Each structure stands twice: as structure tokens, then as C-alpha cells.
């Protein structure tokens, strides 16, 4: 059920976040935005947790973007992985963060906090994302400036993607947000959207249910707050996988 | 001079050939087709050898395609590398296998035997290769059918390259050759070209110095034989790096 894959590269962003890549089974297929069970072998039972696949389905490796919880059963150990180590990966990806469950639209907003950024790494590398949308707004809301992950990638490297680059300079807009200190965009994503600061910064029109589509991935609080905002502006959720709406959303984690 | 990189993936083709990938230094730049010194740390002095870079310069990792010599000082050890191991990689790539040293042409023939295939893995992934040529003929001459490396990649996977695929189906022609047993294309590359079997199979015209360009990488014998053939047909070699000709060539190894 859970075959081992091998850890390739590992990068630590902060004391709380790190990324890693693994090998990918020949028969492993997924839709961009989906999550899969991953984990570790132990002295007893394997430790297994849901993780977004932070890479596109056309890519040769898998990537994961992970929290580090000091006493978390999985991540207390996962944080110490090294190239060559084994990480268990499931066979059955699933999840709600699918552009196929978004009604036709013009602007695609990817609203993520913390590790909620993970599925966006997949989505922004899907060619179909750009076939369907005029603008793709990539966000990450974090606490401090130093917490922003993949910043150089988004700001410098991705606009040079030998293959996606030309399109990305035209369509991909990066909007980092920081809560706990002064910054160009200071606040929760809900607050930056509530008074239209996000749209003003990006040069986009006031939110409109006919035009704007959302994918939302974050804390229980951010999901509740953003859903309340969008619902109050006339946006309708996708009610289940396979049924389209103006937005889709998925818990980045649960407060256990 | 020789910083360590980390081994990522390893694949054994036969008892005599294997491939591996490594991390790449942020400041490491190269022209497609070039070689670099690589090697291993030891109990004394590092073991260092010239290796073609078997990947394109736009890619995030390096790949190498290696012989296994039973009592070879480097490869007796290199064959046992595992994910996570360190491989030394030089800073100063060089070499003659540069499309920039080919006069304008129509068809690009990549004539390789054994590990001579390595630089072609770089060249066939360079977008500039296809800007400059109507057809790219990818060869590997080997002894037995089972020795052909990357066969599924060339025949099945590469024509589906999410980004290079459309172009490759149009322009990339794979021509495997085998000497020691019956096969669609049986013989040395020199022999398959001497009587035009290669051109007939591929549906290309008789060799013509105005139109056909060659990059040649292989054994001392194959280089001598192919140069004699091409020279007798009026093709002129590039005399040095930076001065263009109808063909370029480089030793895949030396008989020590
Ligand atoms: C659909 C889904 C997708 C998920 N995708 C990811 C992902 O891409 N990356 C990832 O790191 N985790 C993801 N998670 C959370 C993940 O399943 C684990 O909870 C996480 O690996 C921590 O495991 P643990 O055993 O160390 O801590 P656990 O005992 O699961 O969690 C303990 C506490 O850690 C905190 N926590 C757990 N995960 C996070 C998190 N991601 N961000 C902030 N705080 C967290 C919460 O306070 C939680 O109560 C996802 C969860 C679900 C349900
Ligand atoms: C410009 C250049 C590029 C090279 N690129 C590559 C490359 O991409 N991949 C690679 O494996 N080697 C390549 N080589 C050969 C390489 O430098 C080493 O010789 C090889 O790694 C074997 O090292 P060793 O110490 O094990 O054997 P060494 O003592 O170097 O060689 C001993 C014997 O092994 C045989 N041999 C060595 N290399 C090969 C080979 N590649 N194919 C068939 N027989 C060989 C010869 O009989 C040689 O006399 C290249 C050499 C040069 C000069
Ligand atoms: Cl929020
Ligand atoms: Cl030959």
C-alpha cells in the first residue's frame, strides 16, 4: 500500500519549514493539486500523514513542502531526512484543489498560508492552468518575512523557466503577505482582500463572481475567514469533488 | 577546485554501463556537449577523470553516463555509488562537441558509440539544436542489443516531453546500431554510412557537405574510421574550439 521512495534533495527554510524531493514510481499518476499519504517506517507501525504533492504531474520527481512540529510524531523524525533515506508514498492521490472543479473564469487566485503554498507549486507548473486563465495570482501568507518559502524561485527563477518562463512573466503574479511585521503587504489574506489592497497592488479589478476563481489552502481559521468573505461577495463553493464552483478549498492541516 | 556534489539517482544498464545524477552548484554553467572533470575522494589523493555532462544546461541536476572498468581506478569505485554519496565535480567545462562550431546546416548527425552517447543527451535537450536544424539523427552504436542505453527514453518518453515533445516527434530520429548480433541496423556506424544504409532507413538524402553536419564521439577506432569516411566525402573538420566546420569530434575515452 505504501512503497518506499528515496529522498533526493532537502532544503530547510526555517526552524519550522523544509522541502524535500523524492523518487516517483513509474505507475504513480496524479492530478495537479492533489494530496497523498506519505510517511516513515519505524520500529513498530509506519507513521502516515496526508501531504500535498508540491510538484506537477509531468515532472520526474515528487516534491513535498513540510511543517516541522517539535513533538509531532511524523515531523519530529521527517525533519531529519537525508538524501538516500526512504519515505513511504501512497498510491491513491485525492483532494479538492482541482482547477477542473472551477467554473470558467478569468483570474485564478491561489490563497495559501504556511504549507498551504504546497499545492500551488503543482498548479503554477500545470500548462492547463494558463490555458484556462488570464492571470494566476500566487500568494503565501506567513508570519514573518523570513518565513516566505521559495521566494527567489518565484521572483527570479520561475520567470526564466526555459519552458514555462515566457508565459509566467505574462500571467503569474506573486503576492507574498506577512502578518507580524511591516511589509509591502501586511496582514492576513482576508484583511488584504476585505479592503481591496491585494487587488490594488496587483492592478486587478474588484472581485467579481463572474470572473474571479479561488483555490484556498491553509489553517482552519484562514479557511473559515476567507470562505466567509467570498460567500458574502456572492461566490459559490464547489460542494464536492467533481462538481464545479467559483472556489475550491482544502485544510492545510487540522488543529489536533 | 573540485567541490563535492551529491548523488541523487543511479541506474545500471548492464555490467558495463550505468548512469547517475548529481546536484549542481548554483554557479556551475556549461555549454551543451561539454565535459568536466569529476571524481571521488579517497584515503589519499582524489581520483579524477574527464566526463561528458549528459544533461542540458537548463536542467536543475547534472547527469553522467559511465563505463564500468573492472580494475579501472575510478570506475571500480564509482560503480558502487548510492544516493547520498559525494562525487567531486570540476568548475571548468570544456570540449569540442559544440553546435556553435558547426557551419549552418540542415541535418545534424550525432554519431556515438558506447558512452559516446553521453554528450548527445545534452545536445538533444538544447532548444537551440532544433532552431538550427531540420532533422537531428541520434545514434548509439553498441555491441549487443542489450547494451543500448536509454532506449525506452528515446523511443517512448522523449516524444512525450511535456515541453520538447512536439518538436522531437518532428525532428528527432533515433538510429540504434548493433555490431555483434542481428538487428535492424547491424554494423559499425562507418559501415552503415559507407553504403548508405543509415540514410535509406531514415529517409534522408545521400551525404552532402553543404547540408549534413556531424558530431562524433566514440572509441579511437570509430573516430578514425568515421573521420576517414567523412573526409573522403568532402567534409571538413572544425580545426579547434571556436572555429566552425562541417563536423566536430571528441574522444569518448583513450586506450591507456
Ligand atoms: C489534506 C491534508 C493535506 C496536508 N498537506 C500537508 C502538507 O503539504 N505539508 C505539511 O507539512 N502538512 C500537511 N498536512 C498536515 C499533515 O498531515 C501532518 O499533520 C503534518 O505532517 C504534521 O504531522 P505530525 O505527526 O508531525 O504532527 P500531527 O500530530 O499531525 O500534528 C500536530 C500539530 O501540528 C500542527 N500542524 C500539523 N501540520 C501542520 C502544518 N502543515 N502547518 C502548520 N501546523 C501544522 C497542528 O497544530 C497540529 O495539531 C496536511 C493535512 C491534510 C489533512
Ligand atoms: C574528453 C573525455 C570525455 C570522457 N567522457 C566520458 C564519459 O562521459 N563517460 C565515461 O564513462 N568515460 C568518459 N571518459 C573516459 C574517462 O575519463 C575515464 O577513462 C573512465 O571514467 C574510466 O576511468 P577508470 O579510472 O575506471 O579507467 P582508466 O584507467 O581511465 O581507463 C582504463 C581503460 O578503460 C577503458 N575505458 C575507459 N573509459 C571508457 C569508456 N568510457 N568506454 C569504454 N572503455 C573505457 C579503456 O580500455 C581504458 O584504457 C572520457 C574521457 C575523455 C578524455
Ligand atoms: Cl486569512
Ligand atoms: Cl564506426
Residue numbers in the entry:
A (entry chain A), B (entry chain A): 4 to 259
Verbatim from the authors:
Ferredoxin-NADP(H) reductases (FNRs, EC 1.18.1.2) constitute a family of hydrophilic FAD-containing monomeric enzymes that deliver NADPH or low potential one-electron donors to redox-based metabolisms in plastids, mitochondria, and bacteria. Structures of bacterial FPRs, as well as those of plastidic FNRs, are folded in two distinct domains: the C-terminus with a binding site for NADP(H) and the N-terminus binding the cofactor FAD. The genome of X. axonopodis pv. citri contains the fpr gene that encodes the FPR (XacFPR). Despite the fact that neither the role of XacFPR nor its potential substrate has been elucidated, its involvement in the oxidative stress response of X. axonopodis pv. citri via interaction with ferredoxin XAC1762 has been proposed.
We here report the crystal structure of XacFPR at a resolution of 1.5 Å. The overall structure of XacFPR strongly resembles those of bacterial FPRs from subclass I. It is organised in the two typical domains present in the ferredoxin-NADP(H) reductase family. The N-terminus (residues 4–98) folds into a six-stranded antiparallel β-barrel (β1–β6) capped by helix α1. FAD binds to this domain, near the N-terminal end of α1 and the carboxy ends of the strands β4 and β5. The C-terminus (residues 99–259) adopts a classical nucleotide binding fold with a five-stranded parallel β-sheet surrounded by nine α-helices. Finally, a chloride ion coming from the crystallization mother liquor is located between helices α8 and α10, at the C-domain, stabilised by the OG1 atom of Thr193 and two water molecules. Subclass IA FPRs, to which XacFPR belongs, are characterised by the short C-terminal sequence VEK. The C-terminal glutamic residue side chain (Glu258, numbering as in XacFPR) establishes an interaction with the O2′ of the FAD ribityl in the XacFPR and Pseudomonas aeruginosa FPR (PaFPR) structures, but not in that of A. vinelandii FPR (AvFPR). Finally, in XacFPR, the exposure of FAD to the solvent is limited by interaction of the phosphoadenosine phosphate moiety of the cofactor with the side chain of Lys259, probably introducing structural restrictions to the enzyme catalytic turnover. Here we describe the first crystal structure of XacFPR. This structure shows structural features that correspond to a protein from bacterial subclass IA but with detectable differences in the mobility of specific loops when compared with other known bacterial FPRs.
